[PDB]
Amino acid sequence: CTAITYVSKDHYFGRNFDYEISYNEVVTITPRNYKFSFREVGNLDHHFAIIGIAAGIADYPLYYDAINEKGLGMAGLNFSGYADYKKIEEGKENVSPFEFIPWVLGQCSTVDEAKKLLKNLNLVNINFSDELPLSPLHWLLADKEQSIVVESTKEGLRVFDNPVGVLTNNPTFDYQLFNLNNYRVLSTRTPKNNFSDQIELDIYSAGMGGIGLPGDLSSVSRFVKATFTKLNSVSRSSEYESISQFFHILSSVEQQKGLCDVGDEKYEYTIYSSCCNLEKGIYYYRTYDNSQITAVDMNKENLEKDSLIVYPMVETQQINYAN
Amino acid sequence: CTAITYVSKDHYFGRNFDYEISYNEVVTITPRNYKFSFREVGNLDHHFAIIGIAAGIADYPLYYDAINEKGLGMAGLNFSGYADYKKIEEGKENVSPFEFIPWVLGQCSTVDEAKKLLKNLNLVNINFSDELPLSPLHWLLADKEQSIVVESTKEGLRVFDNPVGVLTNNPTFDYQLFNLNNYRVLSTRTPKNNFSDQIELDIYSAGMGGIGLPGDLSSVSRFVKATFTKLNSVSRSSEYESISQFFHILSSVEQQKGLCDVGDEKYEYTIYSSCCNLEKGIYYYRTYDNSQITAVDMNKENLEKDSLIVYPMVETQQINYAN
Amino acid sequence: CTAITYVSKDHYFGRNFDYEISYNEVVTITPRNYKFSFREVGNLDHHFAIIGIAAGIADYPLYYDAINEKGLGMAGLNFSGYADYKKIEEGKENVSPFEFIPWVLGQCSTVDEAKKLLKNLNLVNINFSDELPLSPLHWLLADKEQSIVVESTKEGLRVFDNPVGVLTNNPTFDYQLFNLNNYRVLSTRTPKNNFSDQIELDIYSAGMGGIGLPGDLSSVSRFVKATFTKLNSVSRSSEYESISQFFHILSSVEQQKGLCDVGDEKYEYTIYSSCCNLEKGIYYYRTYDNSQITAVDMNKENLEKDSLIVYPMVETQQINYAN
Amino acid sequence: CTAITYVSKDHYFGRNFDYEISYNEVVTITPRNYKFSFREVGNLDHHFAIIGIAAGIADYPLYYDAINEKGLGMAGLNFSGYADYKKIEEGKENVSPFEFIPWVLGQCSTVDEAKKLLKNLNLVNINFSDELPLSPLHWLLADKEQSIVVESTKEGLRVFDNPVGVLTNNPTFDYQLFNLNNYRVLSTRTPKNNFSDQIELDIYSAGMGGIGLPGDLSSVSRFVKATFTKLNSVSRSSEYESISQFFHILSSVEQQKGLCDVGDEKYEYTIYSSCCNLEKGIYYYRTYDNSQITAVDMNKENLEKDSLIVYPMVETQQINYAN
């Protein structure tokens, strides 16, 4: 997985969802009066409306990522072997990872509010059900001001400011930031010949400033390439050019089927790619097999409802036959 | 630019067109009775039908790439500083680079026929017009059997067999093939710990087999990554899954706006990406700002016409609004 | 700096000392009755004998590295910006970095004894003198069983087990170990063509298993290359062959004059390279301008003395003129 | 193998000899009146004196490398699979590779003279003897003005000017020079943060300008690292300091035993390293298990003799026991 934020007049938030198998992903709008029952903290009978992509395997919104009607985004990304969930601890707000996106997005309008809510968080090892055990995750949260990373590991709970608005998988966020130090020299412009003034070295290609940028599908490499591509991106401000650039950034680090074998020719690939406009409450997405951008606008629904609104995903290529 | 061939059940050919500006790109079908007048060789009054993307600046099909009705594809890719075009040479078929795609695709049904035709070729330095001087190019040709590369350089004209079905920009094709030797170790699977059996190294990410793959936008790096991604692609045999995979291969080496500065913030970027089905005569394309695949089917036209059939390219985002 | 341990039959310990200027580096034997006065802990009037290279100040053995007569080695390596030394803390053994090598090597026969001693350590910010402020350092300690790394940073004091027996400069040791995970594929043997079974890739060179190994002079790169070179080294048990291999490992990551400019053509270079036999108490060294190995054997001195025994370093080329 | 030139005040020439097994390598001075009998060209009964290292299994000087009394150096380096030797060709100077160093160094005082002599050369496939078939080689020649590379391949005989004064093994020299283009950015100084002006990236190590420099033992990697290390080496004030720097350049790309397995634990390693002072006719050398520099001075011999003067190499560690 790769999650990013991007600014181009509006502020966008979204992710590549990378896994082996598609589990009936749907776009789900949770309206304001859909009751959230939490196992160990107080219920939210009335809360902010949410739109995101969820696993369509329950009548509870099991979100992989989502934004709320106040412009706050949150995404859970695989963090296998690094994530550690805890026992219920007295004095803490004990929240299960499966409840965590509803818990935050339900009641926070900004990342600063999320920071205050997270001060007493303890992420607890309680499964949604026996049939559906917890995934090992870490989280990116973002609004129009800033983004943060939340990591619950064996040593504890850390909330990091994210100066680049990017997150992938393992290892911890502090290693990911540190590793960018190694790429300081990379550039969008042709470098000078610093190697030796005694010989002539030919600029035989454009793009030589970026040589050294890693192009493989591993977690650290995608973090570096997504960061360089996001930070150096240029768009145009209009919505369509803006989301175009966003999906180009995500394309840069997507995983193609066949290239990442996780054992026995079982391939990890980018099942979908999302781009959310935080100001307008629009969830846009592509899928591996549908290149066309599909848009679901949360504000076109009756957000005073109390039942989940589900949009099944367009998963076949939608071709414009021009003749 | 990056050009590739790919086989699933059908055979596909296409390219990323990477440059600073659009020369009014259009999809042009050249029907059979559109007369080709050649400056220094014999005319083709009747020939194979062709479909490709061209610069729409004249009532000649100035193709960047195309396929013909017999399943032969050809593409010209930037080769700046390496390309050399010649004086008229007696006893040769003297063909200008601007005429070259029409010359080959007009009269050859296969790459083997193209190989025979190319034995007598001399590419001459004749401009289409004063307003349109020649670009420095090299060419990939492909059919369902094989692909070749044509390069006219200062040392002469070389025709290479292309064992990977990929081409980018500079340098010469022999260096490009040779450089793949350096990447023999790359894998789709997790490597064994060969570094030392004395220590335990953790597989902290999937995709570690590919570490070493270059991710920058330079010509050689894109050649290596496109080759690795193409050769290790899997898809099912269906048309939509096949072209999905094809566009994913091209996405892997596309150039995002902002990332390749050739100047004072003059950006090289992937203006369009094409995929042609050689068996069906369908030209499919995406553009930088339209993620939806658009399809133009040469066989839906009256190929006995004698004038160019020109379709505008759909260049703005075609979004499916789901609510 | 790079410090390593290496086993043949005997156990060896040593380092490259990398800096801009050579001062009065000398080989100094501290005999058992040389009284160690400590600024905040109890004095050691009688202790283990030590041999190492020091800065050549009459009043005290200011060691860069050393071993003791019981086969325990310790080295201080530059750790600029990462090292943090503390205020005196009650209930701790408050030891200055300049006292640290004498403090450990004076009273510990093994790394296990050092581990117990270090449980109470607080490294305090007390200069040897006003004219000679503390350097920012971290430490490698080794005996014939194991090695550890000691790091005092802003977060606190950490003692790590060192599974590879290597240390360089910044960042923290945990990041250095983690980064080795990225090099699991590297091999002494020619890799298989894993890139694609569809094409023939030529083994045009020996040594291709190691491609990916970094060759620059930076701290992390030297850590990776020293580790790979040390762990894959082979040598016979005989002393001359063993220290030969050791100096070859150190040569692999040495810094050549001209290549590492730390500002206005001020060059960091490997001033000396040491190899200590822990079992035999011999300090062997080469210097940048003397390739011949020099040996100083601590057991040839009167270790019951109470005064420092100082040997100048042989700093100019000792050439065998053979004809 | 790696061969280099380096200038300090004097001009130096030398090489690492990398192979699996040491035979009877000897330092051999060929005096002026040792008759050179050539199988297919005119004999040189009187010629320039030569000193180099040879295979001491024959009464003829079978040099791996050498310099002559007029300051011209020549070295043969493994070129396996690339070297091609020819049939005797009428009108050419037909010289066997085993005769080639004597042929050039016998009669040329400069590289310019060698260039004229090489205009008619045809390197022929004639073994010295049945017990000793020809090795596949290419050659570096150097004097105080310049250096060249000689490569006889299937396509023919090519003499290149060598702008960097380095040579390794495969592939052809043109590819080796071209590949340097990929390293234009590398520097001896800390790079600017070109990655992004939006974030602060920490200079946590010196030597970061060189990141990207390859550190493995393959032929291309050693070519790049030797070139960068040689070109950015300082010059020095004395003979001793100068050859110290020279051996440091060679050390940078030496092959350590255990790291390069060409077989079933058959290790390629740097058996000897040479440094020749072209002005003084001194052959200096350091073997793998003798770190001390040994010097053999051609001018201390009677160069009017007619028989080879052969010195065994000092192959065991010469240690300075200082106490």
In the Cβ-directed half-sphere of B299, how many Cα atoms lie within 13 Å? 10
CA C227 – CA B64 distance, rounded (Å): 51
Q: Name which of C170, C183, C284 is nearest C224 in CA terms.
A: C183
Q: How many CB atoms are closer than 10 A to CB A302?
A: 10
CA B93 – CA B99 distance, rounded (Å): 12
Sheet with D11-19, side-by-side order of all strands = C320-321, D290-297, D282-287, D269-277, D11-19, D2-7, D166-167
Pairing assessment for the beta strands B25-30 and B50-55 based on DSSP bridges = antiparallel
Do C30 and C49 touch, CB atoms closer than 8 A? Answer: yes
CA C134 – CA C151 distance, rounded (Å): 15
- How far are the Cα atoms of A161, C18, C185, C287, D289 from residue C293, in angstroms, in the given order? 52, 18, 35, 9, 11
Instruction: Give, for B117, the enclosing helix (H) or strand (E).
Output: helix B111-118
Three-state DSSP at C57 gives coil
CA A142 – CA A145 distance, rounded (Å): 8
CB contact set of B102 (below 8 Å; sequence gap of 6+): B30, B36, B44, B47, B50, B61, B63
Q: Which residues of A145-155 are buried (b: 16+ CB within 10 A; e: fewer)?
A: ebbbbbbbeee
Three-state DSSP at C147 gives strand
Q: Which residues of B touch C194 (CB under 8 A)?
A: 184-187, 189, 209
- Largest Cα–Cα distance of chain B, in whole Å? 74
Q: List C17's β-bridge partners, or say none.
A: C272
> Which residue of A164, A184, A201 is in closest CB contact with D181?
A201
Q: Is residue B323 less than 8 Å (CB to CB) from chain A?
A: yes
Residue B124, amino acid: V
DSSP summary character for residue A299:
G
CB contact set of B86 (below 8 Å; sequence gap of 6+): B122, B123, B124, B125, B152
Do A285 and A311 touch, CB atoms closer than 8 A? Answer: no
DSSP summary character for residue C168:
-
Sheet with D63-68, side-by-side order of all strands = D156-161, D147-153, D137-142, D73-78, D63-68, D50-55, D25-30, D309-312
* E runs forming strands in chain D: 2-7, 11-19, 25-30, 50-55, 63-68, 73-78, 93-95, 121-123, 137-142, 147-153, 156-161, 166-167, 269-277, 282-287, 290-297, 309-312, 320-321
Q: Which residues of A touch C175 (CB under 8 A)?
A: 175, 178
Sheet with C26-30, side-by-side order of all strands = C156-161, C147-153, C137-142, C73-78, C63-68, C50-54, C26-30, C309-312
3-state secondary structure labels for all residues of B172-235: CHHHHHHHHHHHCCCCCCCCCCCCCCCCCCCCCCCCHHHCCCECCCCHHHHHHHHHHHHHCCCC
What are the extents of the domains in chain B?
1-313
Sequence-distant contacts of C236-241: CB under 8 A, at least 24 apart: C236/C8, C237/C8, C237/C9, C237/C10, C239/C10, C239/C277, C240/D289, C240/D316, C240/D317, C240/D319, C241/C8, C241/D289
CA B53 – CA B62 distance, rounded (Å): 8
Instruction: Give, for C230, the enclosing helix (H) or strand (E).
Output: helix C219-231
Do D7 and D291 touch, CB atoms closer than 8 A? Answer: no
DSSP summary character for residue C212:
T
Q: List A55's β-bridge partners, or say none.
A: A25
Distance linking the first and last C-alpha atoms of chain B: 38
Q: Are the beta carbons of D211 and A211 separated by less than 8 Å?
A: no
Please provide residue C248's backbone torsions phi and psi, each rounded to the nearest 5 degrees: -65, -40
CA D293 – CA D282 distance, rounded (Å): 12
Three-state DSSP at D30 gives strand
Q: Is residue B244 less than 8 Å (CB to CB) from chain C?
A: no
Q: Which residues of A touch B213 (CB under 8 A)?
A: 214-216
Interface-testing mutation among B146, B183, B185, with chain C (most C C-beta atoms within 10 A): B185
Q: Are the beta carbons of C228 and B196 separated by less than 8 Å?
A: yes
Pairing assessment for the beta strands B282-287 and B25-30 based on DSSP bridges = unpaired
Please report the resolution in angstroms. 2.0
Using alpha carbons only, what angle is made at residue D187 by residues D186 and D191, rounded to the nearest 5 degrees?
100
Helix A111-118 and helix A97-107: axis angle, to 10°?
Answer: 130
Q: Name which of D300, D296, D299 is nearest D312 in CA terms.
A: D296
For chain A positions 140-179, those within 8 Å of chain B (CB to CB) are 169-171
Please provide residue C233's backbone torsions phi and psi, each rounded to the nearest 5 degrees: -65, 150
Peptide bond into C171 cis (omega under 30): yes
Using alpha carbons only, what angle is made at residue B209 by residues B204 and B213, rounded to the nearest 5 degrees?
115
Residue A114, amino acid: A
Residue D128, amino acid: F
Experimental method for this entry?
Answer: X-ray
Using alpha carbons only, what angle is made at residue D87 by residues D81 and D88, rounded to the nearest 5 degrees?
140
How far does the CA of residue A209 sit from the closest CA of chain D (Å)?
8
CA B147 – CA B160 distance, rounded (Å): 9
Q: Is residue C195 less than 8 Å (CB to CB) from chain B?
A: yes
- How far are the Cα atoms of B70, B287, C135, D164 from residue D274, in angstroms, in the given order? 64, 59, 39, 18
Q: Are the beta carbons of C199 and B232 separated by less than 8 Å?
A: no
Q: Which residues of A touch C220 (CB under 8 A)?
A: 182
* Chains in touch with D (≥3 Cβ pairs < 8 A): A, B, C
* Chains in touch with A (≥3 Cβ pairs < 8 A): B, C, D
CA C232 – CA B260 distance, rounded (Å): 41
Quickly list DSSP for D222-288: HHHHHHHHHHTPPP-SSHHHHHHHHHHHHHTT---TTT-BSSSS-B-EEEEEEEEETTTTEEEEEET
Using alpha carbons only, what angle is made at residue C248 by residues C244 and C249, rounded to the nearest 5 degrees?
120
The CATH class given to the B1-313 domain equals alpha beta
Do C54 and C25 touch, CB atoms closer than 8 A? Answer: yes
Q: Name which of A165, A136, A134 is nearest A149 in CA terms.
A: A165
Q: Are the beta carbons of B259 and A294 separated by less than 8 Å?
A: no
Distance linking the first and last C-alpha atoms of chain C: 38
CA A82 – CA A170 distance, rounded (Å): 7
Residue C300, amino acid: K
In the Cβ-directed half-sphere of D265, how many Cα atoms lie within 13 Å? 4
CA C213 – CA C228 distance, rounded (Å): 8
Three-state DSSP at C26 gives strand
Q: Name which of D161, D159, D155 is nearest D138 in CA terms.
A: D159
Three-state DSSP at A37 gives coil
Q: Name which of D97, D83, D117 is nearest D39 in CA terms.
A: D97
CB contact set of C199 (below 8 Å; sequence gap of 6+): B163, B164, B180, B231, C193
- How far are the Cα atoms of C13, C261, D274 from residue C19, in angstroms, in the given order? 20, 11, 27
Q: Is residue C206 less than 8 Å (CB to CB) from chain B?
A: no
Q: Name which of A114, A103, A108, A13 is nearest A66 in CA terms.
A: A13
CA C100 – CA B273 distance, rounded (Å): 64
CA D29 – CA D305 distance, rounded (Å): 10
Q: Name which of B254, B253, B274 is nearest B66 in CA terms.
A: B274
Helix C97-107 and helix C111-118: axis angle, to 10°?
Answer: 130
CA C29 – CA C46 distance, rounded (Å): 14
Q: Name which of A257, A301, A308 is nearest A26 in CA terms.
A: A308
**Burial grade of D57 (CB within 10 A; 0-12, 13-18, 19 or more):** middle
What region, left, alpha or beta, does residue A167 occupy, with left being phi > 0 and alpha being psi -120 to 50 degrees?
A: beta
CA D69 – CA B196 distance, rounded (Å): 48
Q: Are the beta carbons of A203 and D187 separated by less than 8 Å?
A: no
Q: List B297's β-bridge partners, or say none.
A: B282
**What is the token pair recorded at C252?**
């692999």
CA B127 to chain centroid: 22
Q: How many CB atoms are closer than 10 A to CB C113?
A: 15
Please provide residue C19's backbone torsions phi and psi, each rounded to the nearest 5 degrees: -160, 175
Residue D139, amino acid: W
**What is the token pair recorded at C174?**
């945990």
Residue C121, amino acid: L
CA B270 – CA C194 distance, rounded (Å): 30
Q: Which residues of B touch D178 (CB under 8 A)?
A: 171, 175
CB contact set of A90 (below 8 Å; sequence gap of 6+): none
Q: Is A276 a catalytic residue?
A: no
Q: Are the beta carbons of D175 and B171 separated by less than 8 Å?
A: no
CA A285 – CA A243 distance, rounded (Å): 10
**What is the token pair recorded at A176?**
């990911």
CB contact set of D320 (below 8 Å; sequence gap of 6+): C292, C293, C294, C295, C314, C318
Q: Which residues of D touch A178 (CB under 8 A)?
A: 204
What residues of D are annotated to the active site? 1
The residue behind tokens 């454009």 is A206
Q: Name which of B182, C219, B221 is nearest A186 in CA terms.
A: B221
- How far are the Cα atoms of A75, C74, D250 from residue C14, in angstroms, in the given order? 48, 9, 22
**Burial grade of C129 (CB within 10 A; 0-12, 13-18, 19 or more):** exposed
- How far are the Cα atoms of B41, B92, B94, B124 from residue B86, in angstroms, in the given order? 15, 11, 9, 5
**Burial grade of D240 (CB within 10 A; 0-12, 13-18, 19 or more):** middle
For chain D, the residues before each gap (C–N > 2.5 Å) are: none
